[PDB]
Design a protein around this ligand. Structure first.
Ligand SMILES: NC(=O)c1ccc[n+]([C@@H]2O[C@H](COP(=O)([O-])OP(=O)(O)OC[C@H]3O[C@@H](n4cnc5c(N)ncnc54)[C@H](O)[C@@H]3O)[C@@H](O)[C@H]2O)c1
Ligand SMILES: NC(=O)c1ccc[n+]([C@@H]2O[C@H](COP(=O)([O-])OP(=O)(O)OC[C@H]3O[C@@H](n4cnc5c(N)ncnc54)[C@H](O)[C@@H]3O)[C@@H](O)[C@H]2O)c1
Ligand SMILES: NC(=O)c1ccc[n+]([C@@H]2O[C@H](COP(=O)([O-])OP(=O)(O)OC[C@H]3O[C@@H](n4cnc5c(N)ncnc54)[C@H](O)[C@@H]3O)[C@@H](O)[C@H]2O)c1
Ligand SMILES: NC(=O)c1ccc[n+]([C@@H]2O[C@H](COP(=O)([O-])OP(=O)(O)OC[C@H]3O[C@@H](n4cnc5c(N)ncnc54)[C@H](O)[C@@H]3O)[C@@H](O)[C@H]2O)c1
Lengths: 243, 243, 243, 243
């Protein structure tokens, strides 16, 4: 199987590249940066790395030209590339709101549409997993674009699941709570902050990239044949309520 | 009180212009069309009509430069301008997805940020109502951008309610079900379709613009003092469940 | 019009009694206590006070046999009677859990079923408003029964809305955030508790019974003709998210 | 490891018995009937079978007395026993509404409290899985008690997850869509009703008990360390929206 994973240079998407490579998949890795993939690019692993700014829809079109010319058509798409602003909403510029939208929502849409197109043409049973967030279900401060983008992606998941259901293409999302990655690593040296995170959820611990990889493994498995349009929350109780 | 209302040339937004002018508000009306607003312009009702493509963030910026020069700032913002594609997702182009997002989400974001900036600097207690949709809570076919945009707008509402809560700026959404307007008018002479719409909800009728205007009236009233971050569904039971 | 209001001796249901008497409704008041309703009974306002334990389903059955004999069938039902435990779940007894369920869920169910039976017989357009809670959408500590009961009542509201929609019987719920009543009075003299409440929501205030009464007023109005199966959150932003 | 599974005689619960015995768990099976479990007791697999009417709370307390004497505390609890009425709500009796509540909500609650009590006393981790339903998230006709009870169980899951999270007791729910079991078997020979079922979801198939077992298997695994308070929908797209 061929799996295409965005966000491959860091955090959850990188954990996925490593995991799926170890399980003998052919991996197409998409990211705007590649410093964490250079070593692997020098090996003979079945890894194709594309350096791509997924905020640029022209660039995504060029990616599918390249993939089609290389006869590479993934079976599975993991939309994990994403960005998060931390900024007072009055200081969030038009261009920055748009940028978050373009990465977190538009790119998943376009990548999903293109893979679905090729699956419908070839009559293949594809699978998409969208990395949303608990911010797709509730708000947080200083994250207007982020929260909007993640709400959007939950909706998109359900919509595309309905759209391609008769073609046996399954589309699901995962909504992580706090996962220790490069995105969130700054939190973990701050005592006050770690205390407040632990206060906002039920388990006295934090997630790791492997917790989300495991979920992905489940959602792409044969055991997930009846799962489509669902959102799986992996958040140590962050969304359960208020305490 | 000054009320800024997008989508003012048609449908819900147009019913709003009429009703609120009738109630002695000063109205700033935004829309890309103005043919229905011309008659009202001929009167000396306190109505400013702006012809503006809200998909162009530069035209929104010019709008607000004009308003600042005129020392005109709204007390209330109704985000009602919206578009809806009906397009099988494999035929939904990058530009069209992004256009729906830019009208349905980015314009409410920018209008909201700009009014809220002026409220925070003046220490005025503002109110924003976003017209989302039941497509902000569930999916529908051939509506990938629409569903994504309406889900986004619901999360944006929650986020901005949170962001501006300490400044006493309330931000709520309304999720209509089927409302007879120029958007949906084509359905109403199709018997097959009308019967399907009625089977998909609880009440044997459809909504009218006035159903949404009355909800807006409540949400901007003093009786809505403790209401923020809420989504008011006005849908004849369309979202209640199945069968 | 006759309006039947449970919880009539205290808090929200008492504020309803007074308000709706003032607008010329005939009121049927249901509560297990009556000390606050005594003054009202002495006047000859059109108020019928019934002292009833709504956790006793046979007493409810008798009430309706009586009401039938007296030709008092309500046109509107407001289910406001409720209780709330604050008990660590390991100390929450079988009986305490069942009682909270019986009062918060079963009583609304039976009352609703009986009023709707009479509307369907008479071909009347009835209206039910269930007072749920934000604890019907998320969890809180030491409130296992309360949370379960309120999630149930949200479900029940949707279900009855669908069941009775073709008969033009509308069924909606209100989910209050923190409303200052006898239920919550103990909180208001604890400063630390009040601070935590306020930082868990958007608005620096709390709700009053009148906030809920005005929402009731809207939902029973003719302007609510297309509203059924909806849950109206009146909560100062408490549910918007975290921070 | 010991797992207690309710509803062990039929459908999902029975599929669990067989599966987890094959995996070397010691299984405490609970059900009001036992005819499908007789054969298993004939082998000497580590299976305790208990005949118990889980609507009877004293019978639950006697169960725990007897397990305490045998020193068998389960490590994992799967609440799968349930019932569903198909009855027009005007014909749904007080007792039948309460019965559905007692089986579908109150028994999960008591079982959960009792296992949690012993996990907290022994300072052992514990894991609960509650079998809710898509009727826990939306309504369906003729199912007032069932929709109520399943909404309640979703809320109870979230609450208990919050309540016991500091003790590392994880509590999650699974919400199946149409699973072919003895509960639903009657539908499958009805051509028209099958066609309506497929029309209401995205995938042209139905679930099997194994689909829910596999979800349980994931929720009780070490890969589920960060999952609590979550609701996993396994429904073929039934909840995605309306088509
Ligand atoms: N870590 C968390 O706590 C958390 C919580 C919930 C959801 N998420 C989501 O998980 C996903 C992955 O997060 P992460 O923690 O691994 O973050 P990360 O920053 O460690 O990795 C994200 C990767 O995405 C890539 N990316 C960003 N913008 C891109 C662009 N324009 N083009 C191509 N690649 C781009 C980044 O360069 C980076 O390598 C994101 O969508 C994030 O919003 C994370
Ligand atoms: N009518 C329904 O059944 C229904 C259901 C749910 C939600 N809604 C929403 O309600 C809102 C109003 O819908 P309506 O039914 O009144 O539709 P409408 O088409 O009658 O009115 C929409 C107006 O918005 C304006 N508009 C669109 N694009 C714009 C642009 N780029 N710049 C400026 N103005 C623009 C249009 O010119 C038009 O006058 C929309 O957001 C719509 O999605 C409608
Ligand atoms: N006040 C809040 O902050 C808040 C928040 C959310 C929801 N609610 C809900 O609003 C509703 C009204 O609450 P309130 O604040 O007015 O509480 P309150 O305690 O002041 O009034 C509730 C009334 O219901 C009656 N009641 C209780 N059990 C009864 C029984 N067995 N039979 C008859 N009457 C019975 C009580 O006697 C009392 O008069 C409740 O369902 C409650 O859960 C309140
Ligand atoms: N099958 C579906 O399509 C579906 C969909 C959503 C949720 N569910 C839920 O999944 C769970 C399992 O359902 P299933 O399809 O296996 O049903 P089933 O009828 O096949 O099995 C239910 C079992 O629960 C037991 N039970 C019922 N009442 C009991 C009592 N008072 N005490 C002890 N045992 C009792 C029954 O005897 C039976 O063995 C239920 O909670 C059901 O509501 C099923």
């Amino acid at each position: 199987k061929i799996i295409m994973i965005s966000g491959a240079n860091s955090g959850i998407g990188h954990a996925c590249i490593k995991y799926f490579l170890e399980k003998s998949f052919h991996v197409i890795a998409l990211d705007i940066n590649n410093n964490n993939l250079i070593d692997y690019m020098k090996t003979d692993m079945p890894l194709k790395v594309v350096q791509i700014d997924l905020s640029n829809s022209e660039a995504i079109h060029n990616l599918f030209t390249q993939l089609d010319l290389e006869k590479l058509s993934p079976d599975i798409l993991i939309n994990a590339a994403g960005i998060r602003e931390i900024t007072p909403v009055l200081h969030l510029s038009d261009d920055m709101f748009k940028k978050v939208i373009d990465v977190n929502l538009v790119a998943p849409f376009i990548l999903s549409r293109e893979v679905a197109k090729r699956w419908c043409e070839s009559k293949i049973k594809g699978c998409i997993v969208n990395i949303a967030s608990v911010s797709g279900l509730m708000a947080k401060p200083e994250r207007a674009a982020y929260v909007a983008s993640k709400h959007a992606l939950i909706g998109l998941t359900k919509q595309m699941a309905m759209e391609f259901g008769k073609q046996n293409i399954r589309v699901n999302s995962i909504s992580p709570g706090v996962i220790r990655t490069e995105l969130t690593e700054e939190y973990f040296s701050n005592k006050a902050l770690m205390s407040m995170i632990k206060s906002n959820q039920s388990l006295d611990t934090w997630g790791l990239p492997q917790d989300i990889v495991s979920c992905i493994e489940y959602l792409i498995s044969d055991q997930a044949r009846f799962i489509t349009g669902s959102n799986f929350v992996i958040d140590g109780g962050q969304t359960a309520g208020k305490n």
